[PDB]
């Protein structure tokens, strides 16, 4: 009724390539994750009124907890730093040890999927509200997202693009909600050596 994911991310050279490593610890739909699974990501966003869209493609291998995703901004330059979109842009690919596969809400909701909603509050700055559908549509796992960002400072670390293009490791704590809830705090390195925290509040509902 309470476990975590450990997440590690590599961001590689408007465009971003993301390599993700995720495993669970702390304690029917699984058959779609035996192989390598193609992934499609679509995000439509508005931050302080700045509209943008992101499209991503890649594939995931949940038996080892690895994902590779390539993203492009289809509307030109992003109004926010790519690192701030990483957690929004598929926790079904987390590797669960055999002894706790019964807690894998994300795979067991498949193929029908789940709705994933978050509020992400950047400390001393604005917030994102996100709503996503994560599901299989044929042989492909899709993550379809609407993101609304509000209350950001124009000279802050987000709209001012002061975050380093890298990503730290995090623990994502998960408990049963007939869905799940999760809470965690992301740490973003800032170009002046400070850290920008981003509190994540998440609720997932099966479809």
Report phi then psi at 140, rounded to 5: -115, 135
Q: Return the CATH class of domain 1-207.
A: mainly beta
- Determine contact, residues 151/126, Cβ cutoff 8 Å: yes
Residue 43, C-beta contacts closer than 8 angstroms, at least 6 positions apart: 53, 54, 55, 56, 85, 88, 89, 145, 146, 147
* Residue in 73, 116, 70 with CA at minimum distance from that of residue 91: 116
Domain limits of the chain? 1-207
Q: Which helix (H) or strand (E) holds 107?
A: helix 105-108
Q: Which two tokens stand for residue 7?
A: 């997440």
* Residue 106 backbone dihedrals phi, psi, to 5 degrees: -65, -45
CB 189 within 8 A of CB 195: yes
Give the residues after which the backbone of the chain is interrupted, taking a C-to-next-N distance over 2.5 angstroms as a break: 13, 27, 89, 177
């Amino acid at each position: 009724s309470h476990h975590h994911h450990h997440h590690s991310s590599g961001l590689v050279p408007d465009h971003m390539v993301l390599h993700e490593y995720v495993n669970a610890a702390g304690i029917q739909g699984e058959e779609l994750f035996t192989g390598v699974v193609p992934i499609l990501v679509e995000l439509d966003g508005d931050v302080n009124g700045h509209k943008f869209s992101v499209r991503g493609e890649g594939e995931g291998d949940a038996t080892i907890g690895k994902l590779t995703l390539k993203f492009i901004s289809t509307t030109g330059k992003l109004p926010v730093p790519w690192p701030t979109l990483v957690t929004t842009l598929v926790q079904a690919f987390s590797r669960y040890p055999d002894h706790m596969k019964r807690h894998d809400f994300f795979k067991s909701a498949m193929p029908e999927g789940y709705v994933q909603e978050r509020t992400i509050s950047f400390k001393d700055d604005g917030k994102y509200k996100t709503r996503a559908v994560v599901k299989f549509e044929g042989d492909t796992l899709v993550n379809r997202i609407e993101l609304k960002g509000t209350d950001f400072k124009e000279d802050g670390n987000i709209l001012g693009h002061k975050l380093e293009y890298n990503f730290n490791s995090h623990n994502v704590y998960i408990t049963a909600d007939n869905g799940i809830k999760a809470n965690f705090t992301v740490r973003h390195n800032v170009e002046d050596g400070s850290v920008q925290l981003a509190d994540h509040y998440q609720q997932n509902t099966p479809i």
